[PDB]
Amino acid sequence: QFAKPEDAVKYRQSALTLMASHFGRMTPVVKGQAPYDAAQIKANVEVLKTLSALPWAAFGPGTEGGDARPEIWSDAASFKQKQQAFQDNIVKLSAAADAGDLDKLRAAFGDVGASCKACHDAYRKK
Amino acid sequence: QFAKPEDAVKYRQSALTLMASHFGRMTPVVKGQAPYDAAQIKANVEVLKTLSALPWAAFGPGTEGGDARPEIWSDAASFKQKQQAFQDNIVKLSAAADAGDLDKLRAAFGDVGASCKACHDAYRKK
Ligand code: HEC
Ligand code: HEC
């Protein structure tokens, strides 16, 4: 699927755009501005779970470009921990959404959002 | 998630790019150029199933733009049938992939690809 590095960059940017949309659209629910519909949130968090696994294999060898910093590949073990923290927080979000637990969901949502920004601060060009 | 029509256009283009990647990457398998790994294809077709439901609600009212033709909204019942044929063919693809049946999978894959092009021919700017 990534014949040239520019195809990996197009894929990962598309996946990240879709993640941002499925994550950010829950902000009014977690802030009490819109009603919590447990079943609809469960379904949206499942879409976000699928999308959240997709960008990383499009940062494979040789796919420098876009707004990715070089240290993604030069400090690969450190990048992997930032990616892992995010993906661990998506597991917690899915557990909260599956349980219908709005306290857990809002806490997990804040942890996901902080881990998006913690990776950006180290690995995304400003 | 689509505060301005340009946000709906960015979302739907991103979803369609991800669909194209998850669909097209199976072409060598269905053409016998790469080995059929039933479990990996099942998992990829599940990603494609999730992605295939996403673009359509970002062609909502008022979201004219991109390479969408106007007749998507002026002939809405006709667009709906093109979208339905595609989504019906994704159900058949998921059934083949879940059953591990490569004859069914390649037949369903051709039907999906034809329905992508049948919508493009009527509804996507050349
Ligand atoms: C590193 C482990 C990351 C985590 C976790 C998340 N993001 Fe990210 N993001 C990352 C990089 C290296 C880039 C640049 C990719 C490129 O090659 O250009 C991005 C980019 C985005 C974008 C812009 C995509 C675009 O259209 O070009 C968005 C919208 C984005 N990131 C959002 C986002 C969200 C909402 C996250 C958590 C829910 C998230 N990112 C995590 C690296 C990483
Ligand atoms: C109508 C019912 C469609 C079906 C079924 C599929 N596609 Fe499509 N496609 C459609 C439109 C109206 C557009 C333009 C969207 C816009 O506003 O610009 C598209 C666009 C694409 C693109 C380009 C996305 C981009 O990056 O800008 C791709 C890669 C794409 N379409 C692929 C694709 C595939 C592989 C499909 C079936 C598996 C498929 N499309 C179905 C309308 C419709």
CSV table of C-alpha atoms and ligand atoms in Angstrom, one decimal:
chain,number,residue,atom,x,y,z
A,1,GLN,CA,0.0,0.0,0.0
A,2,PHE,CA,3.0,2.4,0.4
A,3,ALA,CA,4.9,2.1,-2.9
A,4,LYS,CA,6.6,5.5,-2.4
A,5,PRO,CA,7.3,7.2,1.0
A,6,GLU,CA,4.8,9.9,-0.1
A,7,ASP,CA,2.1,7.1,-0.1
A,8,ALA,CA,2.9,6.2,3.5
A,9,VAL,CA,2.8,9.9,4.4
A,10,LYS,CA,-0.7,10.3,2.7
A,11,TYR,CA,-2.0,7.2,4.5
A,12,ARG,CA,-0.8,8.1,7.9
A,13,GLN,CA,-2.1,11.8,7.6
A,14,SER,CA,-5.4,10.4,6.5
A,15,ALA,CA,-5.7,8.0,9.4
A,16,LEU,CA,-4.6,10.7,11.9
A,17,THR,CA,-7.2,13.1,10.5
A,18,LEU,CA,-9.9,10.4,10.9
A,19,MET,CA,-8.7,9.7,14.5
A,20,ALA,CA,-8.9,13.4,15.3
A,21,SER,CA,-12.4,13.5,14.0
A,22,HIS,CA,-13.7,10.5,16.0
A,23,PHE,CA,-11.9,11.6,19.2
A,24,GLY,CA,-12.7,15.3,19.1
A,25,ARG,CA,-16.4,14.9,18.3
A,26,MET,CA,-16.8,13.4,21.8
A,27,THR,CA,-15.5,16.5,23.6
A,28,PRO,CA,-19.1,18.0,24.2
A,29,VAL,CA,-20.2,14.7,25.7
A,30,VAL,CA,-17.3,14.4,28.1
A,31,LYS,CA,-17.8,18.2,29.0
A,32,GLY,CA,-21.5,17.7,29.8
A,33,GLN,CA,-22.5,20.0,26.9
A,34,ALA,CA,-24.4,17.2,25.1
A,35,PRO,CA,-26.2,14.1,26.5
A,36,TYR,CA,-24.3,10.9,27.0
A,37,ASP,CA,-25.8,8.2,24.8
A,38,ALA,CA,-23.8,5.1,26.0
A,39,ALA,CA,-24.6,3.0,23.0
A,40,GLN,CA,-23.7,5.7,20.4
A,41,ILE,CA,-20.4,6.4,22.3
A,42,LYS,CA,-19.6,2.7,22.4
A,43,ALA,CA,-20.0,2.5,18.6
A,44,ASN,CA,-17.9,5.6,18.0
A,45,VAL,CA,-15.1,4.5,20.3
A,46,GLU,CA,-15.0,1.2,18.4
A,47,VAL,CA,-14.4,3.2,15.2
A,48,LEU,CA,-11.7,5.2,17.0
A,49,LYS,CA,-10.2,1.9,18.3
A,50,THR,CA,-9.9,0.6,14.6
A,51,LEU,CA,-8.5,3.9,13.4
A,52,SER,CA,-6.0,4.3,16.3
A,53,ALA,CA,-4.0,1.2,15.3
A,54,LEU,CA,-3.5,2.3,11.6
A,55,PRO,CA,-1.0,5.2,11.4
A,56,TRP,CA,2.0,3.4,12.9
A,57,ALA,CA,2.9,0.9,10.3
A,58,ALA,CA,3.0,3.8,7.8
A,59,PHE,CA,6.0,5.2,9.8
A,60,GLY,CA,8.1,2.3,8.5
A,61,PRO,CA,11.7,2.4,7.4
A,62,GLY,CA,12.3,5.0,4.7
A,63,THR,CA,9.1,6.9,5.2
A,64,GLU,CA,10.6,10.2,6.5
A,65,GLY,CA,8.5,13.1,5.3
A,66,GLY,CA,5.4,15.1,6.1
A,67,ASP,CA,5.4,16.8,9.5
A,68,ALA,CA,7.2,13.8,11.1
A,69,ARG,CA,10.4,14.6,12.9
A,70,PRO,CA,13.5,12.4,12.2
A,71,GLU,CA,13.7,11.5,15.8
A,72,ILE,CA,10.8,9.1,15.2
A,73,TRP,CA,13.3,6.8,13.5
A,74,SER,CA,16.6,7.8,15.2
A,75,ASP,CA,15.1,7.3,18.7
A,76,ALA,CA,12.8,4.4,17.7
A,77,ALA,CA,12.6,2.9,21.2
A,78,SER,CA,11.5,6.3,22.6
A,79,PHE,CA,8.9,6.8,19.8
A,80,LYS,CA,7.6,3.3,20.5
A,81,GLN,CA,6.9,4.3,24.1
A,82,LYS,CA,4.9,7.4,23.1
A,83,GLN,CA,2.9,5.3,20.6
A,84,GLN,CA,2.4,2.6,23.3
A,85,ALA,CA,1.2,5.1,25.9
A,86,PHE,CA,-1.4,6.4,23.4
A,87,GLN,CA,-2.5,2.9,22.4
A,88,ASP,CA,-2.7,1.9,26.1
A,89,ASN,CA,-5.0,4.9,26.7
A,90,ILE,CA,-7.2,3.8,23.8
A,91,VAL,CA,-7.7,0.4,25.5
A,92,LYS,CA,-8.8,2.2,28.6
A,93,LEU,CA,-11.2,4.4,26.6
A,94,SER,CA,-12.7,1.3,24.9
A,95,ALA,CA,-13.1,-0.3,28.3
A,96,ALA,CA,-15.0,2.7,29.7
A,97,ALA,CA,-17.2,3.1,26.6
A,98,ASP,CA,-18.0,-0.7,26.6
A,99,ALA,CA,-18.9,-0.5,30.3
A,100,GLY,CA,-21.1,2.6,29.8
A,101,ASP,CA,-19.1,4.4,32.6
A,102,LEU,CA,-19.0,8.1,31.9
A,103,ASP,CA,-16.6,8.9,34.8
A,104,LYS,CA,-14.2,6.4,33.4
A,105,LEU,CA,-14.8,7.6,29.9
A,106,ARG,CA,-14.0,11.2,30.6
A,107,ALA,CA,-10.9,10.3,32.6
A,108,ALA,CA,-9.7,8.0,29.8
A,109,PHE,CA,-10.5,10.6,27.2
A,110,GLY,CA,-8.3,13.2,29.0
A,111,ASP,CA,-5.5,10.7,29.1
A,112,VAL,CA,-5.8,9.9,25.4
A,113,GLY,CA,-5.7,13.6,24.5
A,114,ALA,CA,-2.7,14.2,26.7
A,115,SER,CA,-0.8,11.3,25.0
A,116,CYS,CA,-1.7,12.7,21.5
A,117,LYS,CA,0.0,16.0,22.6
A,118,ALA,CA,2.9,14.3,24.3
A,119,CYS,CA,3.8,12.6,21.0
A,120,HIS,CA,3.3,15.8,19.0
A,121,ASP,CA,5.5,17.8,21.3
A,122,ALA,CA,8.5,15.3,20.7
A,123,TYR,CA,7.8,14.0,17.2
A,124,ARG,CA,5.6,16.3,15.1
A,125,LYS,CA,7.1,19.4,13.3
A,126,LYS,CA,5.7,22.6,14.9
B,1,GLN,CA,-17.1,17.0,13.4
B,2,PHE,CA,-17.9,19.0,10.2
B,3,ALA,CA,-18.2,22.6,11.4
B,4,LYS,CA,-17.6,23.9,7.9
B,5,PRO,CA,-18.3,22.1,4.6
B,6,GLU,CA,-14.5,22.0,4.0
B,7,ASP,CA,-14.2,19.8,7.2
B,8,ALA,CA,-16.8,17.3,5.7
B,9,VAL,CA,-14.8,17.3,2.4
B,10,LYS,CA,-11.5,16.7,4.3
B,11,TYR,CA,-13.1,13.9,6.4
B,12,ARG,CA,-14.7,12.1,3.4
B,13,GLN,CA,-11.5,12.4,1.3
B,14,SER,CA,-9.5,10.9,4.2
B,15,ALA,CA,-11.9,8.0,4.7
B,16,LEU,CA,-12.0,7.3,0.9
B,17,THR,CA,-8.1,7.4,0.8
B,18,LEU,CA,-8.0,4.8,3.7
B,19,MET,CA,-10.7,2.6,1.9
B,20,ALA,CA,-8.7,2.7,-1.3
B,21,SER,CA,-5.6,1.6,0.6
B,22,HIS,CA,-7.3,-1.3,2.5
B,23,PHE,CA,-9.1,-2.5,-0.6
B,24,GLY,CA,-6.3,-2.1,-3.2
B,25,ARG,CA,-3.6,-3.8,-1.1
B,26,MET,CA,-5.5,-7.1,-1.5
B,27,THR,CA,-5.2,-7.0,-5.3
B,28,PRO,CA,-2.1,-9.3,-5.4
B,29,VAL,CA,-3.8,-11.9,-3.2
B,30,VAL,CA,-6.9,-12.0,-5.3
B,31,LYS,CA,-4.8,-12.2,-8.4
B,32,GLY,CA,-2.7,-15.2,-7.0
B,33,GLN,CA,0.5,-13.1,-7.0
B,34,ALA,CA,0.8,-13.3,-3.2
B,35,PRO,CA,-0.2,-16.2,-0.8
B,36,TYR,CA,-3.7,-16.1,0.7
B,37,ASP,CA,-3.4,-15.8,4.5
B,38,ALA,CA,-7.1,-16.2,5.5
B,39,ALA,CA,-6.7,-14.8,9.0
B,40,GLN,CA,-4.7,-11.7,7.8
B,41,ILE,CA,-7.3,-11.1,5.0
B,42,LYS,CA,-10.2,-11.5,7.6
B,43,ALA,CA,-8.6,-8.8,9.8
B,44,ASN,CA,-7.9,-6.4,6.8
B,45,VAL,CA,-11.5,-6.8,5.5
B,46,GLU,CA,-12.7,-5.9,9.0
B,47,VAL,CA,-10.7,-2.7,8.8
B,48,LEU,CA,-12.2,-2.1,5.4
B,49,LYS,CA,-15.7,-2.8,6.7
B,50,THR,CA,-15.3,-0.1,9.4
B,51,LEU,CA,-13.9,2.4,6.9
B,52,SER,CA,-16.5,1.7,4.2
B,53,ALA,CA,-19.3,3.0,6.4
B,54,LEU,CA,-17.6,6.4,7.1
B,55,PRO,CA,-17.6,8.7,4.1
B,56,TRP,CA,-21.4,8.9,3.5
B,57,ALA,CA,-22.5,11.0,6.4
B,58,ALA,CA,-19.9,13.6,5.4
B,59,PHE,CA,-21.9,14.1,2.2
B,60,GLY,CA,-24.6,15.7,4.3
B,61,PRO,CA,-26.7,18.8,3.4
B,62,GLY,CA,-24.6,21.7,2.5
B,63,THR,CA,-21.3,19.8,2.0
B,64,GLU,CA,-21.0,20.4,-1.8
B,65,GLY,CA,-17.3,20.8,-2.6
B,66,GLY,CA,-14.2,18.7,-3.4
B,67,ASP,CA,-14.5,16.4,-6.4
B,68,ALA,CA,-18.2,15.6,-5.5
B,69,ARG,CA,-20.6,16.3,-8.3
B,70,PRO,CA,-23.9,18.2,-7.5
B,71,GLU,CA,-26.0,15.3,-8.6
B,72,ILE,CA,-25.1,13.5,-5.4
B,73,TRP,CA,-27.5,15.9,-3.7
B,74,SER,CA,-29.9,16.8,-6.5
B,75,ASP,CA,-30.5,13.0,-7.4
B,76,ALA,CA,-30.2,11.9,-3.8
B,77,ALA,CA,-32.3,8.7,-4.3
B,78,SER,CA,-30.0,7.7,-7.2
B,79,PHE,CA,-26.8,8.4,-5.2
B,80,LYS,CA,-28.3,6.3,-2.4
B,81,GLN,CA,-28.6,3.3,-4.7
B,82,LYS,CA,-24.9,3.6,-5.8
B,83,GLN,CA,-23.9,3.9,-2.2
B,84,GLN,CA,-26.1,0.9,-1.3
B,85,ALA,CA,-24.7,-1.3,-4.0
B,86,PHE,CA,-21.2,-0.6,-2.7
B,87,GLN,CA,-22.1,-1.2,0.9
B,88,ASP,CA,-24.0,-4.5,-0.1
B,89,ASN,CA,-20.8,-5.7,-1.8
B,90,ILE,CA,-18.8,-4.9,1.3
B,91,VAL,CA,-21.1,-7.2,3.2
B,92,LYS,CA,-20.5,-10.0,0.7
B,93,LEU,CA,-16.7,-9.3,0.9
B,94,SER,CA,-16.8,-9.6,4.7
B,95,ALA,CA,-18.8,-12.8,4.5
B,96,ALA,CA,-16.2,-14.3,2.1
B,97,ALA,CA,-13.2,-13.2,4.2
B,98,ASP,CA,-14.9,-14.4,7.4
B,99,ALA,CA,-15.5,-17.8,5.8
B,100,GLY,CA,-11.9,-18.1,4.5
B,101,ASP,CA,-13.4,-18.7,1.0
B,102,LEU,CA,-10.9,-17.4,-1.7
B,103,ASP,CA,-13.3,-18.0,-4.6
B,104,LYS,CA,-16.0,-16.0,-2.9
B,105,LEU,CA,-13.5,-13.4,-1.8
B,106,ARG,CA,-12.1,-12.7,-5.3
B,107,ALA,CA,-15.7,-12.6,-6.8
B,108,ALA,CA,-16.8,-10.2,-4.1
B,109,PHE,CA,-13.7,-8.1,-4.5
B,110,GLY,CA,-14.4,-7.6,-8.2
B,111,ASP,CA,-18.0,-6.6,-7.4
B,112,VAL,CA,-16.8,-4.1,-4.8
B,113,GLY,CA,-14.3,-2.5,-7.2
B,114,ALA,CA,-16.9,-2.3,-10.0
B,115,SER,CA,-19.3,-0.5,-7.6
B,116,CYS,CA,-16.5,2.0,-6.6
B,117,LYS,CA,-16.1,2.9,-10.3
B,118,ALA,CA,-19.9,2.9,-11.0
B,119,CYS,CA,-20.3,5.6,-8.4
B,120,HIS,CA,-17.3,7.5,-9.6
B,121,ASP,CA,-18.5,7.5,-13.2
B,122,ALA,CA,-21.8,9.2,-12.1
B,123,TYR,CA,-20.8,11.2,-9.1
B,124,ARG,CA,-17.1,12.1,-9.0
B,125,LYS,CA,-15.6,15.0,-11.0
B,126,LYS,CA,-13.3,13.6,-13.7
C,1,HEC,C1,3.0,9.6,18.1
C,1,HEC,C2,3.1,8.4,19.0
C,1,HEC,C3,1.6,10.2,17.9
C,1,HEC,C4,0.4,10.0,18.6
C,1,HEC,C5,0.1,9.1,19.8
C,1,HEC,C6,-0.6,10.8,17.9
C,1,HEC,N1,0.0,11.6,16.9
C,1,HEC,FE1,-0.9,12.9,15.7
C,1,HEC,N2,0.7,13.0,14.6
C,1,HEC,C7,1.9,12.4,14.8
C,1,HEC,C8,3.0,12.7,13.8
C,1,HEC,C9,4.4,12.2,13.7
C,1,HEC,C10,2.2,13.5,12.8
C,1,HEC,C11,2.8,14.0,11.5
C,1,HEC,C12,2.4,12.9,10.4
C,1,HEC,C13,3.0,13.3,9.1
C,1,HEC,O1,3.8,12.6,8.5
C,1,HEC,O2,2.8,14.5,8.7
C,1,HEC,C14,0.9,13.6,13.4
C,1,HEC,C15,-0.1,14.3,12.7
C,1,HEC,C16,-1.5,14.5,13.1
C,1,HEC,C17,-2.5,15.3,12.4
C,1,HEC,C18,-2.4,15.9,11.1
C,1,HEC,C19,-2.6,14.8,10.0
C,1,HEC,C20,-2.6,15.6,8.7
C,1,HEC,O3,-3.8,15.8,8.2
C,1,HEC,O4,-1.6,15.9,8.1
C,1,HEC,C21,-3.7,15.2,13.2
C,1,HEC,C22,-5.0,15.7,13.0
C,1,HEC,C23,-3.2,14.4,14.4
C,1,HEC,N3,-1.9,14.1,14.4
C,1,HEC,C24,-4.1,14.1,15.5
C,1,HEC,C25,-3.8,13.3,16.6
C,1,HEC,C26,-4.8,12.9,17.6
C,1,HEC,C27,-6.3,13.5,17.7
C,1,HEC,C28,-4.2,11.9,18.4
C,1,HEC,C29,-4.7,11.2,19.6
C,1,HEC,C30,-6.1,11.0,19.7
C,1,HEC,C31,-2.8,11.8,17.8
C,1,HEC,N4,-2.7,12.7,16.8
C,1,HEC,C32,-1.9,10.9,18.4
C,1,HEC,C33,2.2,11.6,15.9
C,1,HEC,C34,1.3,11.1,16.9
C,2,HEC,C1,-20.3,6.8,-4.3
C,2,HEC,C2,-21.5,5.9,-3.8
C,2,HEC,C3,-19.0,6.3,-4.1
C,2,HEC,C4,-18.5,4.9,-3.9
C,2,HEC,C5,-19.3,3.6,-3.7
C,2,HEC,C6,-17.1,5.0,-3.8
C,2,HEC,N1,-16.6,6.3,-4.0
C,2,HEC,FE1,-14.7,7.0,-4.1
C,2,HEC,N2,-15.4,8.9,-4.3
C,2,HEC,C7,-16.7,9.3,-4.4
C,2,HEC,C8,-16.8,10.8,-4.5
C,2,HEC,C9,-18.1,11.6,-4.6
C,2,HEC,C10,-15.5,11.2,-4.3
C,2,HEC,C11,-15.0,12.7,-4.3
C,2,HEC,C12,-15.1,13.1,-2.7
C,2,HEC,C13,-14.7,14.6,-2.6
C,2,HEC,O1,-15.5,15.4,-2.0
C,2,HEC,O2,-13.7,15.0,-3.2
C,2,HEC,C14,-14.7,10.0,-4.2
C,2,HEC,C15,-13.3,10.1,-4.0
C,2,HEC,C16,-12.4,9.0,-3.9
C,2,HEC,C17,-10.9,9.1,-3.7
C,2,HEC,C18,-10.1,10.3,-3.6
C,2,HEC,C19,-10.2,10.8,-2.1
C,2,HEC,C20,-9.2,12.0,-2.0
C,2,HEC,O3,-8.1,11.8,-1.5
C,2,HEC,O4,-9.5,13.1,-2.3
C,2,HEC,C21,-10.5,7.8,-3.6
C,2,HEC,C22,-9.1,7.3,-3.4
C,2,HEC,C23,-11.7,7.0,-3.7
C,2,HEC,N3,-12.9,7.7,-4.0
C,2,HEC,C24,-11.6,5.5,-3.7
C,2,HEC,C25,-12.8,4.7,-3.7
C,2,HEC,C26,-12.7,3.2,-3.5
C,2,HEC,C27,-11.4,2.4,-3.5
C,2,HEC,C28,-14.0,2.8,-3.5
C,2,HEC,C29,-14.5,1.4,-3.3
C,2,HEC,C30,-13.7,0.4,-2.6
C,2,HEC,C31,-14.8,4.0,-3.6
C,2,HEC,N4,-14.0,5.1,-3.8
C,2,HEC,C32,-16.2,3.9,-3.6
C,2,HEC,C33,-17.8,8.4,-4.4
C,2,HEC,C34,-17.8,7.1,-4.1
